[model samples]
Target: VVLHPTMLNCMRGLHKKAVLPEPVLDRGIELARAFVGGRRARGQRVERQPDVAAACLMIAAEEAQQPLPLAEVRCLDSSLGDVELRRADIVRELHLEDSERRLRDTFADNLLVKYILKLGLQVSLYLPHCKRLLTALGRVEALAGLTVADRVTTALLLARTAQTLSWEGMEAIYANFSSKAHLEVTKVNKIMHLAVDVLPLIQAAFQ
Candidate 1:
């Protein structure tokens, strides 16, 4: 589970650039350890340590809602190559994607808190409102049939509702939120319109 000095330095470089926050950086390091350890347990070779580090960092960022672009991460570590391919390979081979998605669903409220931090919106009042909205949204039959991405859309929209943000503001937030295909905004506008349908749900959430 220990990391080489090269990998540690690469992570340090990323942190210096503010690309890897402290929480995400720690998770990335832990993930790298697990990744290497898991491979060893399975009798697999552990080559390309830098590539593993890059992929682990990317996964940690995605999990924390602070996703880093593969190109950006690779730029910090010249020894790394094909990070996108490496990340997909690790996610597929290790079966972490589904596991992470399940975790995401269970800790759904954490996503709201991350979004609040990312947007830097005042939240003493709306924190309760957002929680109520999430609870109420959970009971909606229409949303029950939707996919996780839709649930994320619901959360983002709810976050939007929790604060007074302009379209440009939401656009920026959406850009940060939808970094991966799994969390993409296929029907974002449609979902926003659907959000309008839940306007009363939000209003009641306020009360």
Candidate 2:
């Protein structure tokens, strides 16, 4: 059977460090057999090497409770997939913002809000619909009934909207709005600074 180069490399690397349990090994062998048979598998096809490696590493890491080096996993040549996964994780974490705020005290940190904005901005760039949503969010005036969940949902929705416009488009929009609203350039500068504050915290989570 001609395994894809990515799959082969991933399998080889996984085999080097640890052996799977009998049931897991059986499943892996079954997957190999199915691949050789030239039939699509039941679930999603594993196209990215880094995803496969990360799955393997995650299993090993969980079983051992040890940290895996990001570099080693990143060497699998799946930067795009890795980045997507990180973005998805950030999204999931943001989903918990409301819950976290209610359950814990001191939830209104500017740093956390900024982190969400950055990730939202990154995601918005890839999805145009998000830009419209953010434009709407910028108009919200009712903080009276705002719960943590409400804020998180609102923020995420706006971020997704903002992601749709190109950086140039976003800049233009900001400039136009700033001029139209008679707002100072310093206001935009302040927002940008506030938006970036959560990045360090977000980065630290991965390590």
Candidate 3:
């Protein structure tokens, strides 16, 4: 998807300020690449790469005590057109409607359920690791005093972890269940709460 000019500028600016060693920037970029690669491998095209990039840039800025640019936030809104279009492509390609029905039917299958459990466990393991990483960085010498980077890192980590967990959890549920109504309702509620509660808190912390 095409990035809004503001988002692109913000990201480019943050990359400049990151001043991280090549290894550090490479590591972060690698993580972003892995996520995007995984989605593509799963036959899902990412229409939100710009959003993801913007998010990553925000994380870096926050970690470095740099304030988020107002222009970048505006870009996020402007970029929604591309994001939605990409999302539509993924839905069409994945035949998600059929998959959702199939998932409900298989929810009770023991083998499928076991796989879901495994995914959940994996997510649990990563969540704590990311949290600890954020905590550690926040406590670093010069870094500790920089609230922007710390808050941004925490926000991004939380979002990334939650997204991973939620997707795996939904996959598991679909594999062993026959009706997705309950799962769908729960998913919407949980995501809504996360956005409303977690996002505002992160923004407030940054402010």
Q: Rank the candidates by lDDT, best first.
A: 1, 3, 2
RMSD of 3: 19.3
lDDT of each: 0.61, 0.38, 0.39
The per-residue C-alpha lDDT of model 3 at residue 77 equals 39
lDDT of 1 by residue, 39-140 (tens): 888998877666777777767877776655444454455456777676766777777988666545544455555555556655574455566666656666
Measured with C-alpha atoms, the lDDT of residue 55 in candidate 2 is 44
Q: In candidate 3, what are the lDDT values of residues 1-207, reduced to their tens digit?
A: 233465455445445543333443443354345545556677865555655555444333333333233232333334433332432343354344564344333322322222223344443555444444444444434333433322333323344444422422644433222121112334334433444354433333333
TM-score of each model, paired residue for residue: 0.49, 0.25, 0.27
Sort order, TM-score high to low = 1, 3, 2
lDDT of 2: 0.38
TM-score between model 1 and native? 0.49
lDDT leader: 1
* Model 2 lDDT per residue over 1-207, tens place: 455666556655553443324444334433443433332343545355445444444333323323222322333332525633532332243343453333233232222243344344443343333333333333444333343323333344334333322333656655543343233445444454443444333223212
Instruction: Extract clashing residue pairs from model 2.
Output: 124-163, 124-164, 125-163, 130-160, 130-161, 131-161
How much lDDT does candidate 1 score?
Answer: 0.61
